[PDB]
Write a protein that binds this DNA or RNA. Structure first.
Lengths: 52, 64, 107
RNA sequence: UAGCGGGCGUGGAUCCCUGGAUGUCCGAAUGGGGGAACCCGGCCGGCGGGAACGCCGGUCACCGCGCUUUUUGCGCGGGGGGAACCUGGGGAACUGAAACAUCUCAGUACCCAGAGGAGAGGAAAGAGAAAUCGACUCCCUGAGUAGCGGCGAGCGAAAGGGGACCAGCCUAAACCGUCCGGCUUGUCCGGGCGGGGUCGUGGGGCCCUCGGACACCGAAUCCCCAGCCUAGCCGAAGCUGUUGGGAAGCAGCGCCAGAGAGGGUGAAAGCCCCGUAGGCGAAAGGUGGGGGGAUAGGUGAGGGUACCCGAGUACCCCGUGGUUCGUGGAGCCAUGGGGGAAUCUGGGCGGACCACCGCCUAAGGCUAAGUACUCCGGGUGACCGAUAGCGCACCAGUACCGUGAGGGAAAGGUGAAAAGAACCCCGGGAGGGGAGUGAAAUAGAGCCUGAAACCGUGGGCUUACAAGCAGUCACGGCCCCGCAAGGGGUUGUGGCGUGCCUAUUGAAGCAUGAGCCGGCGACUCACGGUCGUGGGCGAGCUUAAGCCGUUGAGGCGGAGGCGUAGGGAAACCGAG
């Protein structure tokens, strides 16, 4: 059951289209504006919350 | 905690593993003398049901 | 332990709410209940006819205290939270990159 | 926590951290006391001039264990408390059985005592069916199974396996060396002390034999250092205007981030104050195998002899607790009496007992670890907001109850901040009328809110020929809202009418609960079953303890229960 759970849920997100697995994150030191400009570039904005 | 199977009726009854509680015939102990074989071969087994639904319950946990 | 605040009895502005943007004076730290008596809360008490210290005229007050979270630093600029450094020897607290503790006299 | 009043610090006070210090009188009280916190006293020593009065510091009750020539005595400890957890020493009744004695409740509450962070326990006369494992406590399944019983109520375990955890040993006795005792001197009986050994194809002793060896391992012990706690240190980014009493809220631009946890800042801030992530920190003290030095200390093969291996015991009986065992064919452990072994063909067990085969070496001892709990430190919650919450939110084990053991309350909020109301006025004051204060005094001092029952004062309608579970339907009088239409209200008349709840064959009942109101207050859950149901699954399902991770983050762990064959009570026969 719960196996499929994740699957279904996660895969259902995929049905919408809101998803991606970047090869490697450009902001390599863990600092805010790195990932921030990175996100503005990676299809992000601000009003959308991230099981990231 | 875990309900206790009634050791007694457990130690003294049958129910065919389909759900039909079928028991053992009595009135057979201190008689026999002026009686006949008719009562003998009849006093060999028994039946029952309906309230042995409540008795089917009393068996409980291992059902049996 | 660490009743310690950040305000020193010298001179500092007041970004309050009562008389907002009022020039804050010598300040007088009082006490450990986060408060200050700058030169501000001006009212008047209904003191009695108390013949000695209050002759035939009794209806007067000057500067009453106030809250300590109502002021901000001062330097050749404005407030902005103070940064402290160990000077190697002493312990000067220069302002937001803008220099000098705001109290001075060899620090 | 105010006034009076006087001091102290950048020669770094207060404040927090540590160590010591002064530490009176009570209290195990401990010199003797004694009705607790009071009254006396002895010896060492001192001060007042101090031999009589008095103080100061010293010293003293008892038990045990270990020494001292009995002696003079020296020595270390003891004794008290403690909420829960803890081991033993005694041991209830109510109840269930729809009575009630067997039984149960339960060896449970409760009394004693002691032990410590632990304990308790603990290295095998084991466990039990196979030539199987191998101290202890803990979690799980085994399983309500195996057992138990006026075979009623009901009570009710162990192996196996899946994990936590890991730990092993001190001895006596064989033999030997010494000091002591005594004695029927003697190739001696008992004692203190060192060597000696520790058991399952037995272990050593003693002599003889193999070759016994640098080493090889190494504590529960010694000591130290990383750390850990008792205080801290620092630490990211903003303004202008705007309504408002007050902005943090309204717009304009800008900003920190490993930190947009939270509280507070006159309200609602990531850049106001306190802080959050991160990063350092002990001079003195306490705590720690984490790492190591070190230390106590541990290891061989063989022949013979014929030495010892735990004595008022095991073993039989009797009276028996515990365990599934309520005495049954009744085992094993433990023990009160009586009978009373041996030292390995010795002993105990394999559920009465005898035969065959296996298990393990008794009657002396110490053991960390995981267990258990909450006086307590911090941390959290689909926990509560002054009838709730702990009994105790505020000086609650205070009031006050009773000699007494013991009972057991009530009682919170002004504001951002006291600015907590001078001066006039009436008044003895009290309290108010003004003023003055703040945003506001409908926040005015047990003062945010202020209801209900509730007692007043004004007004509208109605009432002084009238028969009432108090209203209802209609109509008129009326007064006031209304553009209309209508609406509130009120009752002048007349048709209709035996309160509520409980209880009852059945109530207006002259059966009862109830004065009125505010509030508190009763069908839940924990295990398992059982029918129906929503879904994943499919002859398949699903893990339990736990472990890995987490900081509201999940996955992993197949022991096991479920399901396919039942039928005979059984051996067992098998879709029969």
């Amino acid at each position: 059951v719960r196996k499929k759970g994740l699957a279904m849920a996660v895969a259902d997100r995929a049905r919408e289209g809101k998803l991606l697995l970047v090869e490697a994150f450009a902001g390599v030191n863990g600092k805010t504006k790195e990932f921030l400009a990175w996100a503005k570039e990676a299809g992000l904005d601000g009003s959308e919350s991230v099981l990231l | 905690p875990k309900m206790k199977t009634h050791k007694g009726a457990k130690k003294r009854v049958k129910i065919t593993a389909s759900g039909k509680v079928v028991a053992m015939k009595t009135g057979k102990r201190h008689l026999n003398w002026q009686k006949s074989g008719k009562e003998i071969r009849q006093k060999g087994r028994k039946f029952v049901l309906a309230k042995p639904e409540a008795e089917r319950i009393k068996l409980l946990l291992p059902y049996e | 332990r660490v009743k310690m605040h950040v305000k020193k009895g010298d001179t500092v502005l007041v970004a309050s709410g009562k008389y907002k943007g009022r020039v804050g004076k010598v300040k007088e730290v009082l006490p450990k209940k986060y408060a200050v008596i700058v030169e501000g809360v001006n009212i008047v008490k209904k003191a009695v006819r108390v013949s000695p210290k209050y002759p035939q005229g009794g209806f007067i007050e000057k500067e009453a205290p106030l809250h300590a979270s109502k002021v901000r630093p001062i330097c050749p600029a404005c407030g902005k939270p103070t940064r402290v450094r160990k000077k190697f020897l002493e312990n000067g607290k220069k302002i937001r990159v803008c220099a000098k503790c705001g109290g001075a006299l060899d620090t």
